[PDB]
Each structure stands twice: as structure tokens, then as C-alpha cells.
Amino acid sequence: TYSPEKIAQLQVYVNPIAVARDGMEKRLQGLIADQNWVDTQTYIHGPLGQLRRDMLGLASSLLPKDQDKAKTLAKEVFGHLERLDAAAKDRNGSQAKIQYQEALADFDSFLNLLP
């Protein structure tokens, strides 16, 4: 089980990951709608640039029975964000919208598994 002290440790990683989730829907969604590909790329590298470190550090801190699912879901989020960055470099708004939605779906799955 997750003790209170353990949960507090997990929260150090949760804090920036939750803000990242909020920022994807509040800010990145509108940059993509705006066909603003320069700032879409910067959003991924600045405001979301620590997501790989934080979500992997979180998943690696979980009880053994949950580490695998959490790592798998994190890697899905990273692959769709990678494809969203590629889409923006290519000015491909069709893929930028798809990859945004796909990244969010797996990001929500990752959050939902947390204790």
C-alpha cells in the first residue's frame, strides 16, 4: 500500500504534472486552433519540457504493481507529443489536432491510475 509519507513523495512529481495537464487544455489547445505553430513548438519544449523527467520519475516511484502501466502510459503521452511537435514543424494542423487529442487521452489515463 501507499502510506501518507509515500503519497507526499509522489506529490512532488504530481504538482508540475497536474499544472502541465491544465496548461495543455487552457493554452496549447488554443495555440493549435490558432495555427500558431511556432508557439505550439515552444509550448512543448518549455512549459511541457520537463514532462518526460517528471512522469518517468513518478512512474518509477510507484508500487511495483503500477510502475509498468504508468511507464507505458507515459511513453504513449511522449510519443503523441513528439508527433504533435513534428506536426507543428510541418504546419500540419490536421495531425496537430489529432495528436493533441491522443496525448490528452493517455495523459488522463496516467493521472487516473495515481493513488
From Swiss-Prot:
Which keywords has UniProt assigned to this entry?
Answer: Lipoprotein, Membrane, Metal-binding, Palmitate, Photosynthesis, Photosystem II, Signal, Thylakoid
Q: How does it assemble?
A: PSII is composed of 1 copy each of membrane proteins PsbA, PsbB, PsbC, PsbD, PsbE, PsbF, PsbH, PsbI, PsbJ, PsbK, PsbL, PsbM, PsbT, PsbX, PsbY, PsbZ, Psb30/Ycf12, peripheral proteins PsbO, CyanoQ (PsbQ), PsbU, PsbV and a large number of cofactors. It forms dimeric complexes. Pull-down experiments with His-tagged PsbQ pull down dimeric, but not monomeric, PSII.
What topology does the record note for this protein and the membrane?
Lipid-anchor
Gene Ontology molecular function terms on file: calcium ion binding
State the practical use: Addition of an 8-His tag to the C-terminus of this protein allows purification of intact photosystem II (PSII) on a Ni(2+) affinity column. PSII purified this way has more PsbV and a higher Mn content (reflecting presence of the oxygen evolving complex) than PSII purified via His tagged-PsbB on Ni(2+) affinity columns, and has more O(2) evolving activity.
One GO cellular component term of this record is: extrinsic component of membrane
Gene disruption phenotype = Wild-type growth in BG11 medium, at 30 degrees Celsius with 30 umol photons/m(2)/s; slightly reduced growth in Ca(2+) or Cl(-) depleted medium. Up to 60% decreased rates of O(2) evolution. Wild-type growth in BG11 medium, at 30 degrees Celsius with 25 umol photons/m(2)/s, wild-type growth under Ca(2+), Cl(-) or iron-limiting conditions, about 10% decrease in O(2) evolution rate; slightly slower growth in double psbO-psbQ or psbQ-psbU mutants, no growth of psbQ-psbV mutants. Increased accumulation of intermediate assembly forms of PSII.
Q: Which domain of life is it from?
A: Bacteria
The yes or no answer to whether the keyword Metal-binding is present is yes
Which residues of the entire protein appear here: the answer is 32 to 146 of 149
Anything else known = When crystallized in the presence of Zn(2+) this protein dimerizes, but neither Zn-binding nor dimerization are thought to be physiologically relevant.
Belongs to which family?
A: Belongs to the PsbQ family. CyanoQ subfamily.
Sorted alphabetically, the Gene Ontology BP terms of this entry are:
photosynthesis
Post-translational modification remark: The N-terminus is blocked. Upon expression in E.coli the N-terminus is modified with a diacylglycerol and an acyl group bound to two palmitates and one palmitoleate.
Briefly state the protein's biological role.
Answer: One of the extrinsic, lumenal subunits of photosystem II (PSII), which stabilize and protect the oxygen-evolving complex. PSII is a light-driven water plastoquinone oxidoreductase, using light energy to abstract electrons from H(2)O, generating a proton gradient subsequently used for ATP formation. Plays a role in the stability of the oxygen-evolving center on the luminal side of PSII. Required for optimal photoautotrophic growth in the absence of Ca(2+) or Cl(-), functions in optimizing PSII water oxidation/O(2) evolving activity. Requires PsbO to bind to PSII.
Entry annotated with the keyword Metal-binding: yes
Expression is induced as follows: Transcribed constitutively under all conditions tested.
Localisation per UniProt entry: Cellular thylakoid membrane
| Protein name in UniProt | CyanoQ
